Design a protein around this ligand. Sequence first.
Ligand SMILES: Nc1ncnc2c1ncn2[C@@H]1O[C@H](COP(=O)(O)OP(=O)(O)OC[C@H]2O[C@H](O)[C@H](O)[C@@H]2O)[C@@H](O)[C@H]1O
Ligand SMILES: NC(=O)c1ccc(O)cc1
Ligand SMILES: [Cl-]
Ligand SMILES: [Cl-]
Ligand SMILES: [Zn+2]
Length: 282
Amino acid sequence: PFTADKGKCGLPEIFDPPEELERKVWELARLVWQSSSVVFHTGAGISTASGIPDFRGPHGVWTMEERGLAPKFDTTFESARPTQTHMALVQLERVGLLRFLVSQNVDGLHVRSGFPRDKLAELHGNMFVEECAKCKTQYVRDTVVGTMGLKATGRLCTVACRGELRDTILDWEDSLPDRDLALADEASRNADLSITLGTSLQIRPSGNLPLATKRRGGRLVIVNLQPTKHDRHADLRIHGYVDEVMTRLMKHLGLEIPAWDGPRVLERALPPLPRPPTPKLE
Ligand SMILES: Nc1ncnc2c1ncn2[C@@H]1O[C@H](COP(=O)(O)OP(=O)(O)OC[C@H]2O[C@H](O)[C@H](O)[C@@H]2O)[C@@H](O)[C@H]1O
Ligand SMILES: NC(=O)c1ccc(O)cc1
Ligand SMILES: [Cl-]
Ligand SMILES: [Cl-]
Ligand SMILES: [Zn+2]
């Protein structure tokens, strides 16, 4: 926990100039249009615009600890609103342009945004989710589960069991949830486009999953303010705020970003909603 490798913290941010950013976001739109199977990979950078600090950014949790300072939260986890980026991802799944979503985030925001749980891998856990040790039944709570490291919360299973409820928050030594990793790995390998949003890709195996898309000629897009571990393997790197990238992308795809009605849990994805006809590309 103390000796745990926290990776490269507080690397300088990169800002693509406006003409370059507009061009790269048009190229991302072209890639989404051309791809059969698009998989999104999200980390802490997609929640910074809701007041949750990241880990390895200039003011990240690990970066500030390294400098003897404290990360700053501008929200509780319960009061945090899904970002433009979170709601863009909801819409992209709804209209059938997102096959699967792989997240390292424990902030509960993809679930709370109404994103379907059967198309989401929560590789590091969810602070609002507790799981029965006996029957594996998950409970998605309206408040953060008060423990971390897969400890007993003090609550019991209510399935028609009285099993011990435990948090789903991995500690450093804990292996990833087998179901979530297996589905994330399958999605990434089968994808012809992986798009990374606000992750430095430094954690194994989470950070390596986007590389799996590159096997069999798949394309990799990295959207991140800082360098990432796998920048060399990216067909496209966009250095800008993930909300600016995603609002511009949605505008190019002819999609609105849906309203957030407050915390809502969706277990299963629906058939795709209607979406705009595709442009002629070549
Ligand atoms: N608004 C933004 N727009 C674009 N990029 C952003 C923004 N905000 C931050 N970034 C970038 O977003 C990136 C986030 O990188 P990291 O902070 O390493 O977060 P992770 O999710 O990959 O951390 C993985 C695990 O490591 C931990 O131990 C936990 O277990 C995590 O689950 C940074 O490079 C920022 O430049
Ligand atoms: N619980 C935490 O310390 C924490 C910090 C930042 C995040 O983005 C998520 C969780
Ligand atoms: Cl922490
Ligand atoms: Cl909180
Ligand atoms: Zn149970």
